[PDB]
């Protein structure tokens, strides 16, 4: 391999949810604040974040993270999140992932740090066992006990709250929440996001209730708590998505179930899990989501000019 | 543990070359070898090419001595599921994978598996072409009633797995429609199943080949292939590919030595042809494949989903 293009990256998952960060090979985006990188980044290298992040060396699962020197003082890094059909502002699952990247590499030692986005800037706590908490966004509960009829199923109830995204929280499902059952779980997921908009069930202001939680218990009858979350690109969370988890114990504090400081574990559908805290705050929470990432793979990821899907394929 | 692999795709078909460090599965042949990794390594497989590494898509492709001395390497192929025998893209992969790390030349060479030794050529523009194994029609003209789209007639093929193809599609052939055209082929799946429609001997009818055209107006031949796990095939699909071939000749539209073009879902494209063998004919196909990275799997201990994601 002399011929072409290298990338220098390495995987890591944060509860079974991946993470590709880009350490060296990347065209410069210029001296501008994070976020005209990223429009750079889109207007004239997007077919740099489809090589990366695309098939067949990406997935529909795969969020890249590009590491760029921080313009914030404050923080280790900046970056930048992207996924096979654009560009992302804030990633809790790729933020656990950068932070135990660096860490891995030497770059940083237990203690807090941040990181800095194109939309601000995330405080982390990296732990001398690895565990690194992430301060998420302010989250509450918008409506309760929220009924869509879902064709082929029936009467769904749930609650509509904000975790940084807008989901559907309903504790109903047609099948044990396990790996087994995805492909049922995201026809069910789907079927219940495309009866709220036809139903015009909306957050605030209109929002589009893109996201989908179930949350249930692990199907091992110990009544742990497990979740299944539908994405917006129709592909569940491996891993029980911060957002989804900080809406989740937004509306357990509306209804006085967990307690300020309380930990409440969460599992997703591989039953890896999360830890979920919160303060009071405004109107809502304040909630502090804690994770694992373990690196899986260092790689050179190999351009070859004459390669029809050199820059990734695309629809 | 470290595992040296690199990665490749054959027309957007995935396919992990492991090349180091890999447990040493003992001095038996290579059928001995792939169950050896079956009772003793499996963790190894998921590992490799299950998530989070690996997916639905991609094959794994062990290189280990080979026991016949004229191969250049015997190979065990693996997914996400379990054990292969051959695998035609998987196969492309590994010669042009040996080719780019200088371990062999354009020319003839052959590729031995648990199931046998495959003759390849590999051409001066990288071009490779395999042997299919021996290809034929079982049934002509099934049908299926598919909830949504009434009748779906189609023959039931061999090609080394066994096909239902159809010509009938739901829609255009393109990426853009692929939740679609999933849908539609599982459907037809699932009522062959209940009406106990199968291949010879009872064999499950787990692929499913729409043979239409390239909805650019161009004329040309493409086919979608869903496989055993409900992911589509992103190649033009070896063995589906051959089992059209088969079909073709018993109708008499393919002549033996007669080139046949077959793009699949993404564009890309197989060369198919084939000569007369018993029943059935003797396919060969070539494609090309392409690097896209150079990887050291990383597997720690702490690591929960270490040895891979499995249900
Ligand atoms: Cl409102």
Redesign the pocket.
């Known amino acids: 391999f002399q011929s072409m293009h290298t990338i220098d990256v390495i995987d890591s998952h944060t509860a079974g949810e991946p993470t590709r960060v880009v350490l060296a090979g990347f065209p410069d985006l210029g001296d501008g604040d994070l976020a005209q990188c990223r429009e750079r980044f889109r207007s004239d290298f997007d077919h740099w974040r489809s090589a990366i992040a695309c098939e067949p060396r990406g997935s529909d699962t795969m969020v890249g993270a590009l590491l760029l020197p921080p313009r914030d003082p404050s923080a280790c890094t900046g970056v930048i999140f992207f996924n096979n059909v654009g560009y992302l502002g804030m990633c809790g699952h790729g933020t656990i992932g950068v932070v135990r990247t660096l860490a891995e590499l030497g770059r940083i030692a237990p203690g807090q740090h941040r990181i800095e986005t194109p939309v601000g800037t995330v405080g982390v706590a990296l732990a001398d066992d690895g565990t690194v908490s992430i301060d998420n966004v302010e989250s509450y509960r ?1 409506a309760a006990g929220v009924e869509v009829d879902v064709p082929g199923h029936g009467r769904v109830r749930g609650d509509v709250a904000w975790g940084g995204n807008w989901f559907f929280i309903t504790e109903q499902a047609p099948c044990a929440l396990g790996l087994a059952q995805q492909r049922e779980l995201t026809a069910y997921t789907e079927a219940i996001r495309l009866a709220l908009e036809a139903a015009g069930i909306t ?4 929002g589009e209730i893109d996201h989908i939680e179930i949350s249930g218990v692990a199907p091992d009858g110990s009544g742990a708590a497990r979740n299944f979350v539908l994405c917006p690109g129709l592909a569940y969370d491996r891993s029980p998505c911060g957002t989804g988890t900080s809406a989740k114990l937004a509306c357990l504090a509306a209804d006085g179930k967990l307690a300020e400081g309380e930990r409440w574990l969460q599992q997703g559908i591989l039953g890896s899990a999360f830890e979920g805290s919160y303060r009071h705050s405004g109107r809502g929470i304040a909630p502090r989501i804690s994770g694992h990432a373990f690196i899986t793979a260092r790689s050179q990821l190999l351009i070859d000019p004459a390669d029809p899907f050199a820059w990734g394929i695309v629809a």
């Open positions: 918008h957050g605030e202001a209109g």
